[PDB]
């Protein structure tokens, strides 16, 4: 009420910890700031066959990728490439 929630979330790419600040906007979009760059991201999850797919727009660029989250790893498979990002495990 009267304020916006910003979530501080950390993900690890390779050996590098990345801090992303996600503000949950009223419209349902998310504004994410990594370092000094701010990105406007909107997205949905849709299922084709047995594979969940993520349809997302970052700063107006739109893309589709297959999303699998297994253990502490997020796997995004797209034609442009496959990226694997890790979720840090609490002590």
């Amino acid at each position: 009420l009267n304020i916006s929630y910003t979530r501080n979330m950390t993900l690890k790419d390779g050996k590098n910890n990345v801090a992303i600040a996600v503000t949950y906007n009223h419209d349902g979009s998310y504004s994410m700031q990594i370092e000094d760059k701010t990105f406007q991201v909107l997205g949905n999850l849709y299922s084709e066959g047995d594979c969940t797919y993520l349809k997302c727009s970052v700063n107006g660029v739109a893309s589709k990728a297959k999303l699998i989250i297994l253990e502490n790893t997020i796997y995004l498979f797209s034609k442009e490439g496959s990226i694997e990002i890790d979720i840090p495990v609490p002590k």
């Binding site: 009420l1 009267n2 304020i3 929630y5 979530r7 501080n8 949950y24 609490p90 002590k91």
Partner: protein, 541 residues
């Protein structure tokens, strides 16, 4: 069969009209003023205090709540403006305490967290009142209470307003004991120092969690121990998680850090063996047919102008569907049935001065809702009761009392929203704070006082005009405003929403565009408790 087509409320406002343009501009400024003030309160004690707090490895109080509640769930904060300019030279953002309702492990709970960055978490008189209000809300709705304890004790310079009385600090432990006896879970998370009465909070809780080094629980602090017995002992040795967890036994769970403690708290709530059950019928939710932000233009900030309360209703109820009861009788009052987020609700709203017919119509409506166990929503925009020799001869007071007496005895959940003025006995008839509505909210344009500022000025302008006309020394027109201007200033200052909200008279000042969401969250929380049968007194026919 629910396929019947029905009429809907609301009309499209004239956006081009000058009145709408002016009203929108004025209301928007009030909302912007409200938003930026909350932003400042969001920062608590300040950068230096916040930096010191983090330097000790502790989470900030609002970050603790974010991690405690379910991911992405809304959080209904209460009394954000408690202590706003309440004390002459001391700034106490939010009263030094953060209270609200959020979902933990799928269960609605009341969260009460001390703000250690504000005066080191000391308990000011408003701090006690805010906490007591939160406990009252939790008990009336059977909401489990979670205490994120990080406090510095009572504020000694104002002890007389904290310690002694029934509604003073002592009542906090009384409420904990009563809720525990009713199977309303009491969970305490010691994430910092708690001393003197503070140590009782973890001790009085059903289940208790303490952080490894930050948390400390002593009835007598090290300073008192040294004075009484001349011994030097650190806070950790006197209290500490290890002593209570392993030796004293005061601690039920031992946590490494703030994140670990919050994770443990979620596990504790999941083991409450509680499942929510609804006593009311439910229908699929529907959005209102009109934008909510149009309320800015419709209502404005000028209380002298009048608007149709039906317009407000049309923009908050599901599908803008409303069944009006006794539409043509006592038209200054509007009563009817609607639904908000699927819940059934009976709405009572002012549309003018209260009359004998209006009071009778309200009394009849309240009996209907109580019979069917339907929650009640009140929309207060009052300007007083009808004044006249004939009306008194016909027992307007007798009629007005009928409504005060029905509203008081009603046992269905009651929520009050002040969208305008709230003066005199009209406040009581429309379920004021004194009549225990489950929640009470006010719009940024509201005014509340014993009477309108002008009436008090005019009344005095009769008493002293009489005083000097009857005495015989003449009292001139300039003598009139040396009488009227101070009165009008006082009532304007003390009727301001921030003045009312700084003290805990309401549960918060809300943006009109957020009215539907706040009501939906509030009614959902109020339904955690079963609805009881209503017993009425004697209706003075």
């Amino acid at each position: 069969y629910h396929g019947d087509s029905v009429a809907s409320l609301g009309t499209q406002p004239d956006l081009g009209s000058a009145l709408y343009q002016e009203n929108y501009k004025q209301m928007k400024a009030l909302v912007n003023q409200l938003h930026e003030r909350v932003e400042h309160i969001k920062l608590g004690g300040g950068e230096k205090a916040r930096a010191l707090h983090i330097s000790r490895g502790k989470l900030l109080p609002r970050e603790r709540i974010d991690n405690l509640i379910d991911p992405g769930s809304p959080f209904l904060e209460l009394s954000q403006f408690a202590g706003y300019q309440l004390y002459d030279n001391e700034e106490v953002p939010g009263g030094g305490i953060i209270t609200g309702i959020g979902r933990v492990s799928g269960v609605e709970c009341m969260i009460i967290a001390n703000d250690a960055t504000v005066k080191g978490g000391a308990y000011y008189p408003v701090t006690v009142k805010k906490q007591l209000r939160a406990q009252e809300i939790a008990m009336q709705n059977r909401l489990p209470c979670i205490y994120l304890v990080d406090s510095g004790g009572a504020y000694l310079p104002r002890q007389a307003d904290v310690f002694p009385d029934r509604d003073h600090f002592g009542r906090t432990f009384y409420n904990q004991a009563i809720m525990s006896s009713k199977n309303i879970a009491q969970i305490a998370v010691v994430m910092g120092s708690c001393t003197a009465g503070g140590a009782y909070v973890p001790a009085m809780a059903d289940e208790n969690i303490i952080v490894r080094k930050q948390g400390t629980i002593f009835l007598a602090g090290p300073p008192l121990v040294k004075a009484a017995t001349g011994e030097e002992v650190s806070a950790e040795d006197l209290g500490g998680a290890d002593l209570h967890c392993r030796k004293s036994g005061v601690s039920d769970h031992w946590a490494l850090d703030d994140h670990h403690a919050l994770h443990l708290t979620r596990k504790v709530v999941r083991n409450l063996n509680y499942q929510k059950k609804l006593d009311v019928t439910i229908e699929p939710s529907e959005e209102p047919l009109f934008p909510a932000d149009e309320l800015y233009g419709i209502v404005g900030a000028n209380l002298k102008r009048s608007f149709d309360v039906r317009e407000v209703i049309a923009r908050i109820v599901d599908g803008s569907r409303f069944t009006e009861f006794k539409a043509f009788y006592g038209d200054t009052l509007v009563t009817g049935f609607a639904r908000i987020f699927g819940y059934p609700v009976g709405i009572v709203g002012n549309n003018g001065v209260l009359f004998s017919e209006s009071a009778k119509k309200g009394t009849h409506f309240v009996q209907l809702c109580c019979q069917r166990n339907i929650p009640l929503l009140f929309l207060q925009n009052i300007t007083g009761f009808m004044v006249g020799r004939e009306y008194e001869a016909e027992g307007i007071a007798k009629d007005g009392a009928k409504m005060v007496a029905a509203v008081a005895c009603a046992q269905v959940p009651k929520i009050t929203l002040i969208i305008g003025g709230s003066y005199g006995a009209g406040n009581y008839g429309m379920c004021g704070r004194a009549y225990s509505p489950r929640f009470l909210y006010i719009w940024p344009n509201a005014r509340i006082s014993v009477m309108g500022g002008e009436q008090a000025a005019n009344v005095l302008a009769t008493i002293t005009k009489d005083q000097r006309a009857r005495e015989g020394k003449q009292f001139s027109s300039a003598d009139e405003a040396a009488l009227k201007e101070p009165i009008i200033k006082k009532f304007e200052e003390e009727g301001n929403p921030y003045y009312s909200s700084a003290r805990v008279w309401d549960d918060g000042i809300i943006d009109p565009a957020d009215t539907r969401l706040v009501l939906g969250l509030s009614f959902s929380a109020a339904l955690n408790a079963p609805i009881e049968k209503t017993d009425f007194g004697i209706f003075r026919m």
